[PDB]
């Protein structure tokens, strides 16, 4: 049998996912676990029972898309690692562009670490609309996965000719475009596989299949290091840190679109990360739908199951820790 599924990881993922969903009294949840070098899908878990939401359900990614805007800006030389960007909030007409805190300025590392919508939108604004549209398209947004499961759709990437000026701003921190958790996890292979986006596979891969280069290898390596700051003190994703490893991750918290408004009530909490951060072996992605108890942010809600799924996955795959254990 040549199937990529690993039953121990799949069982680990399902149990931790259901604990998190129950503890936060959430409506639903999904997990994807990938081989970070080949794109093999090691686990897909969904709750409550029924359809494969990891493949079928399109979500807005929120700040989980920010790593790719930051990488693109660095890759194209439109920013660097020492620029400090004014990150004061502002508005375009009625629409605000603001962070949860007012940071007067941040470098690119701070934009990632703090999850600055303002910083990301200003980096994105250095590109034209059609450029960015093509960029989201080559990340696979709007491109069907052909996983073999029914109910799968391509996702949403609106035509660039219809973008209002505010739209390109808000798309850069995860508004307006839609993708499945599988498409989102797939995009993170461009960061783990040294700039090369992988197709993903449900069968064991003897080699890493031929991918498509999105970023230079140096860009991917620098961005992975920025993402380690997310799980260290000062970042939004400390709940996902794993003993004996450096973890690059990104949190996301998206207001749900109820009828015709973005609810300040209901949220989707996402945590996606990879380890070992220098030479990744595993990607773990977790999305918790509408938590109602014990917090609703991505770090607090989906961070804890990420940490237990990642740590156990590395243990199951025999990945040696890169630094002394302290737990
Ligand atoms: C509620 O805001 N709605 C947004 C949006 O701007 N989301 C951004 C995003 O991904 N965010 C994240 C985060 O990184 O988790 C955060 C997390 S900050 C945080 N994390 C904790 O774990 C914690 O205990 N406390 N705090 C303060 C701010 S909302 C923002 C949105 C984007 S698309 C969409 N439909 N909604
Ligand atoms: Cl490859």
- Answer yes or no: is the C-beta of 276 below 6 A from any ligand 1 atom: no
Q: Which atom of ligand 1 is nearest to the CA of 66?
A: 10
174 and 67 Cβ atoms separated by less than 8 Å: no
Q: Are 69 and 40 in contact (CB under 8 A)?
A: no
Closest CA to 42 of 207, 252, 203, 226: 203
Report the greatest alpha carbon distance in the chain. 58
Three-state SS string over the chain comes to: CCECCCHHHHHHHHHHHHHHHHHCCCCEEEEEEEECCCCEEEEEEEECCCCCHHHHCCECCHHHHHHHHHHHHHHCCCCCCCCEEECCCEEECCEEECCCCCCCEEEHHHHHHHCCHHHHHHHHCCCCHHHHHHHHHHCCCCCCCCCCCCCCCCCECCCHHHCCHHHHHHHCCCCCCEECHHHHHHHCHHHHCCCEECCCECECCCCCCCCEECCCHHHHHHHHHHHHCCCCCCCCCHHHCCCCCCCEEEEEEEEEEECCEEEEEEEEEEEEEEECCCCCCEEEEEEEECCCCCCCCHHHHHHHHHHHHHHHHHHHCCCCCCCCCCC
Distance (Å) of CA 114 to CA 89, 184, 238, 267: 14, 20, 11, 19
Among residues 203, 236, 22, 21, the alpha carbon closest in space to that of 117 is found at 236
Which ligand sits closest to the CA of 287? 1
Name 278's Cβ contacts closer than 8 Å, sequence gap at least 6.
224, 246, 322
Ligand nearest 209 Cα, by number?
Answer: 2
Check if 297 has its Cβ closer than 6 Å to any atom of ligand 1: yes
Ligand 1 mutation target, pool 62, 234, 269, 273, most atoms within 8 A of CB: 62
Q: In this structure, what are the phi and psi dihedrals at residue 156, rounded to the nearest 5 degrees? A: -120, 120
Task: Write phi, then psi, for 272 (nearest 5 degrees).
Answer: -135, 135
Task: State which approach was used to obtain the coordinates.
Answer: X-ray
CA distance 135 to 149: 26
Q: Other CB atoms closer than 10 Å to residue 122's CB: what's the count?
A: 20
216, 195 in Cβ contact below 8 A?
yes
d(CA 117, CA 104) in angstroms, rounded, equals 13
Q: Residue of the nearest CA to atom 28 in ligand 1?
A: 100
Tell me if 26 sits within 8 A of 140, measured CB to CB: no
Sign of CA dihedral 202, 206, 212, 218: positive
Closest Cα to atom 15 of ligand 1: 252
Scanning the structure block, which residue is given the tokens 């770090």?
Answer: 299
Q: Which atom of ligand 1 is nearest to the CA of 117?
A: 6
Q: Are 139 and 185 in contact (CB under 8 A)?
A: no
Write out the two tokens for 182: 């599988």
299 lines ligand 1 (CB under 6 A): yes
Ligand 1 atom closest to Cα of residue 303:
22
CA 298 to ligand 1 center in whole angstroms: 7
- Which ligand is nearest the CA of 262, by number? 1
Q: How many CB atoms lie within 10 A of CB 77?
A: 7
Interatomic CA distance for residues 263 and 100, integer angstroms = 16
Q: Which residues does 100 contact at the CB level (< 8 Å), separation at least 6?
A: 115
Any ligand 1 atom below 6 A from CB of 312: no
Q: Is the CB of 216 under 6 A from ligand 1?
A: no
Give distance in angstroms: CA of 254 to centre of ligand 2: 32
Rg (CA), the chain: 18
Ligand closest to the CA atom of residue 193: 2
What residue has token string 């081989």?
A: 35
Paired tokens of 224: 């992975």
**Helix 117-124 vs helix 66-75: angle between axes, to the nearest 10 degrees?**
40
63 lines ligand 1 (CB under 6 A): yes
CA 311/CA 292 separation, integer angstroms:
26
Locate the ligand 1 atom nearest the alpha carbon of residue 250 and give its number: 14
Mutation to probe ligand 1, out of 63, 177, 288 (largest number of atoms < 8 A from CB): 63
**Alpha-carbon torsion, ordered 132, 138, 139, 140, to 10 deg:** 120
Whether 193 contacts 199, CB under 8 Å = no
CB under 8 Å, gap of 24 or more: what pairs does 255-260 form? Answer: 256/290, 257/60
The residues pairing with 129 across neighbouring beta strands, listed in sequence order, are none
User: Residues 238, 239, 243, 245: what is their CA dihedral angle, to the nearest 10 degrees?
Assistant: -50
Q: Residue whose CA is closest, atom 29 of ligand 1? A: 253
Burial (0-12, 13-18, 19+ Cβ within 10 Å), 63: buried
């Amino acid at each position: 049998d040549m199937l990529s599924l690993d039953q121990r990881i799949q069982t680990l993922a399902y149990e931790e996912l259901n604990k998190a969903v129950e503890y936060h009294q959430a409506k639903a949840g999904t997990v994807v676990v990938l081989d970070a070098r080949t794109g093999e899908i090691l686990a897909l878990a969904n709750t409550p029972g029924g359809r494969n939401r990891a493949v079928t359900d399109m979500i807005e990614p929120g700040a989980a898309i920010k790593p790719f805007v930051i990488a693109k800006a660095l890759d194209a030389g439109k920013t660097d690692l020492n620029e400090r960007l004014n990150t004061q909030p502002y508005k375009i007409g009625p629409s605000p562009v603001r962070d949860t805190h007012v940071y007067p300025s941040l470098d690119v590392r701070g934009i990632m670490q703090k999850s600055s919508n303002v910083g990301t939108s200003k980096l994105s604004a250095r590109f034209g609309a059609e450029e960015m549209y093509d960029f989201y398209h080559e990340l696979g947004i709007g491109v069907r996965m052909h996983s073999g499961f029914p109910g799968e759709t391509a996702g949403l990437l609106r035509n660039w000719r219809r973008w209002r000026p505010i739209e390109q701003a808000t798309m850069s921190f995860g508004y307006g475009l839609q993708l499945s958790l599988l498409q989102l996890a797939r995009a993170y292979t461009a960061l783990t596989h040294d700039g090369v986006l992988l197709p993903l596979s449900f069968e064991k891969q003897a080699v890493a299949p031929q991918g498509k280069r999105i970023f230079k290898e140096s860009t991917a390596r620098e961005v992975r290091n920025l993402m380690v700051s997310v799980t260290e003190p000062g970042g939004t994703g400390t709940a996902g840190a794993v003993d004996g490893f450096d973890v690059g991750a990104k949190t996301g918290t998206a207001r749900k679109f109820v009828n015709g408004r973005y609810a300040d009530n209901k949220h989707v909490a996402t945590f996606i990360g990879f380890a070992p951060a220098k030479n990744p072996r595993v990607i773990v992605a977790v999305t918790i739908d509408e938590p109602t108890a014990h917090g609703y942010y991505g770090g607090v809600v989906a961070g804890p199951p990420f940490k237990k799924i990642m740590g156990g996955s590395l243990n199951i795959l025999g990945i040696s820790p890169t630094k002394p254990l302290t737990a």
